[PDB]
Point group: none
Chain length 46, copies 35
């Protein structure tokens, strides 16, 4: 008997890897929101 | 295995790009508020 | 991919446009205050 | 798109209109002060 | 739209009305000063 | 499709209507201030 | 729809009512000033 | 087929009904603020 | 073969129809909020 | 394949259309506030 | 040969029928949510 | 030799035929779900 | 065939019933907020 | 020849009969879910 | 359906009640200002 | 023939019974959320 | 040998065809949600 | 509603009361001026 | 069926209870503001 | 962008204009004082 | 072996295509909100 | 419900109390002005 | 049959218990906001 | 003849018995989810 | 990333520009006050 | 259930405490104004 | 017969155990949100 | 004996291959959602 | 007789073993989701 | 069962801690305003 | 694992950067107010 | 059995770590708002 | 961070500059008063 | 909890300190007025 | 956990720093007022 759940070990790793990309780039756009929101609040402020 | 989360890299970029447009033009109108508010405060001032 | 945030470009422009109207006409009434205040201060003055 | 800030044009106008009434009638009472002050100063004068 | 600044028309009128009372009665006392001053100056005169 | 934003047309109208009442009666009390202020200034004047 | 801005009609009325009291009694003290000022000016006069 | 969104017609109506109560009674307290503010401004005035 | 997705055409239509009712009557209550909010802001205003 | 997102094109348009109505009529009431505020400030002014 | 899928025609109909009941009465409770939410928003509003 | 699999040709056809009925009427009930779900989502929405 | 969706009729009713309790008592606490907010605004007011 | 598939006619009927019981009582518990879900959503709501 | 916005009727009433207390006692201190201001103006007067 | 779906009648009943417990106790915790949320909103309020 | 999976080619095509209808009409109702949501957000907005 | 502007009635009264004291004692010193002025004028006279 | 929304009745009550504490103690600090503001205005006054 | 502060240019001008009227007519009464003072001093002179 | 997931390549593309339409037109209505919100804030501003 | 605006009753009282101190001591310095003014007028007198 | 939903009774209780901790400590920080806000308003006040 | 389906009576009973264990202990873990979810919602709440 | 706050640079500039107009023309009317005050003081002088 | 709003009792107390410090020290500077104003008025007096 | 659902008793226990870890550590990050949100609200506050 | 599960090795590989295509292109459309959601949130934001 | 279900004992054990690997590594990716979600919520938060 | 909401106890504490820093340093700048305002009022005073 | 919140580090920086621009240019207009206010106060002064 | 929720322990930690970065840098921009707001209030102040 | 309050340095300077103009020219008219007063006193003298 | 209003203690002190400078130097110029007024009165005297 | 509110410590410091500049230069212009007022009072004096 056996079952080489080793390719899982690896392939799941890439899953993690891309979620790091989407997880990152996604944040890149939340910053534009964030900053544009800081500026919006800056203008309406004074 | 694989998963080309490369079109994400790009497409998210445009998301950023338009948020820069809305983020910008939006501000364009906060300025009208801002300035019209400076002027309003100018008139009520004296 | 894409996203035509071009109608934004325009429509936000009208937003600016009317805020110019309200921004203007509003001031029209602050002048009545202003002037009626100059006159009030004229009368109480002498 | 659009936004009929035309009723503003008009309604703000009446705002101006009544401020002309208050602005006027108000002055009517500053005259009583004014004149009664001229007379007061007339009497204390001689 | 509207704004009945008609009760203003009236109420301001009474404001005028009482200022006529104070404006009058006030003068009543400036006369006592006035006359008592004429008499004072009459006595010190001769 | 559709959406009868007609009851809005009307109901908002009453909103306007009562704001005319509060907008009016409110002014009724600013007149008491106003006039009592004219009289106060009348008395302290002479 | 509706909105009974009728209790406003009334309650604002009392606001007017008390401002008439303060507006009156306040004047009561401006008279003491007034008269004591007439008398002061009477004494310094002669 | 069907769907009797008739009990909606009614029940939403009561929603409107109570919002008229809260909408009204709420205003009842803004009047106390309002009037007590007129009086406060009356006293600090003279 | 076949599949008469014609009763869908119709029945979905009523779905639209009632959502127009809820979509409408719902708005009816947002107006009470809206107007009662205009009035609330009217009172706290002056 | 396909997907006629054409009824969207239209129906969203009406959404825009009514928001223009609410967007307009709403403003109608902000004017009553606005003007009643100009007048309020007119009275407290003099 | 044959197969009388006629009792289907009918029985499925009742399925529709009760889903109209649940579909209706269910909505009855979403209205309580809805309205109680309008009122909640009414109170927190002013 | 032979084998008249012709009655198959036909009888299977009716099988198709009724599956069109069940296939249709079944959908009739998924619409009640569907629409009642649109309405449910309409109510919880606003 | 059949399906007694009658216990639904009833049980859903109680669901409505308790939502009336929570819907009510909930409001009870929004009033404490409301009133304590009126009072807070009363104190900061004068 | 023959085959009395008449006891089928009947016995299948009871099968239907009990499925009506399970079909019913089952629903009885989906209502507790349903209502407890309406209430849960009521509480988290306000 | 229903919603007992009756505890609102009452509780809002107390809100009014205390605002009458703060509204009153607050005024109590504006009188000390007021009178101490009359006296101050009395002394600087003569 | 037969099938005693009577133990179903009963056992499903207990299912209902415990869902009443979970349905209840669950709510017990939504109240802590609820109230702690009222208090949180109380503090941030003033 | 053989197997004419040609009627599949076609019949699956209609499957696609109706899913285009449901896929379309379904969207028709999401627009009512959508727009009624834009309007709802319009009203609560101002 | 209400507003007990009764403590005003009283407290303003004391304001009057002390202004009578200052108003009196003040005069006490204008007499010393007065008389010392009569005497001064007596001496320079002869 | 059932749902003991009785612990709600109670627990919400405490929510009310503490909001009375925060609602009270909060006011305690608005008084320090209030009074320190009366005194500040007392000093700048004379 | 923009802001037509042109109606200001004009309206302020009228403010100037009336202040010229009050500024003038006011002087008209200071002349009566002036001259009546010259005459008063003429008489007391000889 | 094989599997022509090429029609996927294309059909998914249209999915993208319409989401661009809804994604666009949707924004068209957020602009009406946006601008009507700028204007609303313009009016309440002055 | 409730709201113990009793600590207000008291704390506002101290506000009154200190305003009596400032109100008093303030006057103490107006007397130095007053008297030094009587004396100044005494000296310049003769 | 059975189902010991007794560990629920207990475990849910702790859920309540910790929400009391978070519910409490959370408030601890809203007080720092609160008080620092009272002080901020104290400083900007005078 | 015969068939002692009595060991079924019993053995099925244990099946019920363990499903009560799994049915219970399973719930034990849904509570950890449940409570940890209440707490999670507690923290994100305030 | 980015955010072209360049239109701000400019538009704020015009705000400055008009405030220069109002700032100027406003002064134009303070001169009429000023001069008419010099003249008033000239006449009352001699 | 519960909620220890006891740390509120205390922490709000310190808020009061520091407002007493700012409330006090603030006054310390209004005295410098006050006195320097008495002296200024002393010098310009004679 | 039998079935040792004893390893369930245990293994489910660990499931509970780790959910306590995730349930805990998860909260650890909601605190960073929480606190960073308190601080964010602290800064925007004053 | 034997069994060449080698064509499996390969054919499963293509399965992986296309799932990479669908897995990829699928994501292509989630980006349109994603970005259109960022933009939607951008507009509703300011 | 016999049957060595001992290799089951073992082989099932490895099944458990790998499910621990997949069960673990799987979680590894839910953490990236989790954390990237905490961060996403961090950014949109402030 | 359990849930160590102990790291909350602590971490929330730091939240309090920094809000004390911002709460403090913030005040540091309100003092510059405060004092510069005392001085400004000092200069404009005399 | 990981998450490159480094683009945040940077992009937030620009947010700061533009807020420095708006923060600056905004002030540019408060100076026009400021100075025009100094001049206004200069003219009304003498 | 087992489940190494140890990588959770760690990975969640980084989640905390970056939220500290965003939590920090975010604040960096609220300071620019804060300070630019102090300065804005400084200028409009005097 | 930063904030270029350098344009303040300059712009305030011009404020000073014009106040020097008004401050000067104003004096120019006080001289006409002054001298015309010397001459007036010259004539009435002899 | 806490709040170090100690930097207030100090910074307010300097506020006092400079007001002593302005309070002093200001007086320095009132002396020039004073003395130049004594001398003016000396010359016009004889 | 943590939160480096250290950049606050610093950045707020500059806020203080510029308010010292505006706080200073502002005063620079109040001196021109001040002195030009001393001179104005010098001229009108003699």
């Amino acid at each position: 008997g056996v079952i080489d759940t080793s390719a899982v070990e690896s392939a799941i790793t890439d899953g993690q890897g891309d979620m790091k990309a989407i997880g990152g780039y996604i944040v890149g756009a939340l910053v534009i929101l964030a900053v544009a929101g800081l500026i919006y609040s800056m203008l309406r402020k004074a």
